[PDB]
Write an enzyme that holds these catalytic residues in place. Structure first.
Site, PDB file in Angstrom:
ATOM      1  N   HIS A   1       0.803  -1.214   0.000  1.00 47.40           N
ATOM      2  CA  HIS A   1       0.000   0.000   0.000  1.00 47.40           C
ATOM      3  C   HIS A   1       0.846   1.279   0.000  1.00 47.40           C
ATOM      4  O   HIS A   1       0.273   2.350  -0.081  1.00 47.40           O
ATOM      5  CB  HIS A   1      -1.085   0.025   1.103  1.00 47.40           C
TER       6      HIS A   1
ATOM      7  N   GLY B   1       2.479   6.022  10.552  1.00 42.37           N
ATOM      8  CA  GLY B   1       3.894   5.876  10.225  1.00 42.37           C
ATOM      9  C   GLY B   1       4.497   4.554  10.679  1.00 42.37           C
ATOM     10  O   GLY B   1       5.653   4.251  10.367  1.00 42.37           O
TER      11      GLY B   1
ATOM     12  N   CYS C   1       3.391   1.448   9.805  1.00 42.10           N
ATOM     13  CA  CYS C   1       3.217   0.401   8.781  1.00 42.10           C
ATOM     14  C   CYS C   1       4.577  -0.123   8.338  1.00 42.10           C
ATOM     15  O   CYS C   1       5.505   0.669   8.157  1.00 42.10           O
ATOM     16  CB  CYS C   1       2.395   0.912   7.597  1.00 42.10           C
TER      17      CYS C   1
HETATM   18  C1  LIG Z   1      -2.662   8.100  15.993  1.00 45.45           C
HETATM   19  N1  LIG Z   1      -2.647   6.981  15.070  1.00 45.45           N
HETATM   20  C2  LIG Z   1      -3.608   6.801  14.163  1.00 45.45           C
HETATM   21  O1  LIG Z   1      -4.584   7.548  14.078  1.00 45.45           O
HETATM   22  C3  LIG Z   1      -3.444   5.647  13.229  1.00 45.45           C
HETATM   23  C4  LIG Z   1      -3.703   5.803  11.863  1.00 45.45           C
HETATM   24  C5  LIG Z   1      -3.382   4.821  10.973  1.00 45.45           C
HETATM   25  C6  LIG Z   1      -2.781   3.610  11.404  1.00 45.45           C
HETATM   26  C7  LIG Z   1      -2.369   2.573  10.514  1.00 45.45           C
HETATM   27  N2  LIG Z   1      -2.558   2.769   9.129  1.00 45.45           N
HETATM   28  C8  LIG Z   1      -3.600   2.384   8.367  1.00 45.45           C
HETATM   29  O2  LIG Z   1      -4.537   1.711   8.785  1.00 45.45           O
HETATM   30  C9  LIG Z   1      -3.548   2.878   6.934  1.00 45.45           C
HETATM   31  C10 LIG Z   1      -4.323   1.996   5.982  1.00 45.45           C
HETATM   32  C11 LIG Z   1      -5.564   2.386   5.493  1.00 45.45           C
HETATM   33  C12 LIG Z   1      -6.270   1.574   4.618  1.00 45.45           C
HETATM   34  C13 LIG Z   1      -5.752   0.348   4.229  1.00 45.45           C
HETATM   35  C14 LIG Z   1      -4.530  -0.041   4.731  1.00 45.45           C
HETATM   36 CL1  LIG Z   1      -3.929  -1.635   4.368  1.00 45.45          CL
HETATM   37  C15 LIG Z   1      -3.801   0.771   5.582  1.00 45.45           C
HETATM   38  C16 LIG Z   1      -1.795   1.438  11.083  1.00 45.45           C
HETATM   39  N3  LIG Z   1      -1.600   1.246  12.393  1.00 45.45           N
HETATM   40  C17 LIG Z   1      -1.957   2.218  13.214  1.00 45.45           C
HETATM   41  C18 LIG Z   1      -2.554   3.430  12.797  1.00 45.45           C
HETATM   42  C19 LIG Z   1      -2.908   4.468  13.688  1.00 45.45           C
END
Ligand SMILES: CNC(=O)c1ccc2c(NC(=O)Cc3cccc(Cl)c3)cncc2c1
Ligand SMILES: CNC(=O)c1ccc2c(NC(=O)Cc3cccc(Cl)c3)cncc2c1
Ligand SMILES: [Cl-]
Lengths: 305, 298
Positions: free
Chosen positions: B41, B136, B138
């Site tokens: 992604h 960040g 991922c």
């Molecule tokens: C303060 N942290 C956040 O708001 C947050 C945001 C995002 C977080 C995150 N990332 C995603 O989910 C992005 C994504 C969206 C759609 C599809 C896919 Cl495969 C990936 C991972 N792990 C933790 C997170 C935490």
């Protein structure tokens, strides 16, 4: 999202662990530059521990009595000196893996990572706090002496603890890296017991602010309290007195959530009175005190859910 | 003495973390030999179509203060494999392993290619992990260590609406019914890992906590009828066999320890704790208990 007890990455510390042998005793050493630091009780037998004269035991030792092993390589000891309860072994090779470091003496309530080692080999890493009674609730077996506690802030390793012994209740005692013990403990087999332990109040409050940041507010109420009234109730539950310094330190977490420290203190008073009633806070059914206000800011997001 | 949630030393993994940037997205990569592995992604969906439009120089890989030059790229399931010009000199002995729900692992949480913390967690029966991650994170990885070999088992991809985490093995196959895109996805109802709760009760007995023991025993069938009512995973004969060494060390038969768990499920803890916990802990496997109460080094 999510809240875990998190340790610092141990890589910079793993590169410093060595095995120290003196006669029949084998424990861990911390090799920084051309010096290996380890508990001075490595020169003792089980018998000596009752009333050891370390100066007398050390004067009878030569450099070749100390075997230092870094991985599969033997280090040559070229000098030795004692600083309080730590033995400093001058070696012939400087550690090429020596990180940027400082020796720091922490206060009760402060947290740190522990790299538990046996025979100079690291076996695991965990997070813990210096208890108000100066003990640490660690996870240690025989041969773990010389395992170290540390924090890594930016690119600098701050060494704050060296493991020396286990007390009869299963808790642990040790020194800073200058050999000064935390608490009224001695490296002596004596009837010494940990004092009554208390809950680190400023840390419980920080953990309640972490729960509010992660979207949980069920424990909040419409009440406030004076600092004095809070401490009169807190003492009744074996909680450490909350000082004005603790209130000042909690300032940024209060600003981020919009909940004044004495308002958060009133929720803690109510939690102590009522219990949790089948509910949890950050997946815990007990009030957590091993996360500092600094750890919460470090781990949690800067935007409240 | 003492019982902590303990992670493996992360040193061998810290030496593999890199920062991967593609356009405006920045996440973490795992640099092993001359290949950098990261979530697909990062190119964000028809991934083959988005990838065909990319060239090697579109991917910026940074290892510490050094820029790595990407010389090739390919996709394997939900992981992107970036062929780099430099082999990682810090590459440890490693294997890619797919774990089962109930099994535990260490997570080295990273941001911008820099490791910030290490923690222990378990693959839940619903295939999610209760981790701690921010934007960040991922590309952060899960692992175990066997002697000197690092077994990579997890790569972080996303956070679900309930705050739990989902990701893939190192071959890009997701754990659970999840897909890597912005859509409506929810974690299924979770269950308690029973074999792990039992191991944690054996750990409490080893550390001198026996208040929950009773003179009673149970059949495996009767235990599972009670367990199914409290959202506990069924205990199989394999789980009983695996608990054998802990039963031998303490002198408490597995079905005798099952009778103690039956009583804790029906009547609670009554103001008491086990290993400083007021809840029954399920994120320690029988092997983790043996390792923490033996002194196994790496
Ligand atoms: C303060 N942290 C956040 O708001 C947050 C945001 C995002 C977080 C995150 N990332 C995603 O989910 C992005 C994504 C969206 C759609 C599809 C896919 Cl495969 C990936 C991972 N792990 C933790 C997170 C935490
Ligand atoms: C299961 N745990 C144990 O049996 C055990 C045994 C021993 C443990 C240990 N060792 C000592 O205390 C050695 C020593 C004895 C007297 C005085 C001094 Cl200063 C040092 C350290 N850390 C943890 C331990 C754990
Ligand atoms: Cl401090």
């Amino acid at each position: 999202s999510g809240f875990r007890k998190m340790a610092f990455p141990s890589g910079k510390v793993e590169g410093c662990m060595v095995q120290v042998t003196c006669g029949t005793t084998t424990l861990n050493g911390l090799w920084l530059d051309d010096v290996v630091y380890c508990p001075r009780h490595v020169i003792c037998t089980s018998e000596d521990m009752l009333n050891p004269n370390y100066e007398d035991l050390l004067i009878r030792k030569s450099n070749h009595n100390f075997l230092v092993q870094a991985g599969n390589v033997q280090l040559r000891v070229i000098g030795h000196s004692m600083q309080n309860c730590v033995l400093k072994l001058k070696v012939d090779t400087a550690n090429p893996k020596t990180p940027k470091y400082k020796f720091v003496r922490i206060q009760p309530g402060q947290t740190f990572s522990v790299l538990a080692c046996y025979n100079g080999s690291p076996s695991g890493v965990y997070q813990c706090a210096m208890r108000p009674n100066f003990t640490i609730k660690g996870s240690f077996l025989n041969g773990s002496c010389g395992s170290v506690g540390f924090n890594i802030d930016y690119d600098c390793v701050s060494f704050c603890y060296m493991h020396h012994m286990e007390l009869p209740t299963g808790v642990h005692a040790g020194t800073d890296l200058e050999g000064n013990f935390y608490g009224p403990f001695v490296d002596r087999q004596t009837a010494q017991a940990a004092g009554t332990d208390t809950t680190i109040t400023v840390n419980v409050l920080a953990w309640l602010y972490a729960a509010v940041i992660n979207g949980d507010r069920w424990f909040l109420n419409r009440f406030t309290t004076t600092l004095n009234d809070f401490n009169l109730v807190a003492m009744k539950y074996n909680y450490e007195p909350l000082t004005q310094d603790h209130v000042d330190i909690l300032g940024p977490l209060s600003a981020q959530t919009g909940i004044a420290v004495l308002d958060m203190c009133a929720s803690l008073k109510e939690l102590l009175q009522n219990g949790m009633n089948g509910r949890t806070i950050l997946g815990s059914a007990l009030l957590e005190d091993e996360f500092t206000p600094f750890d919460v800011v470090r781990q949690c997001s800067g935007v409240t859910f």
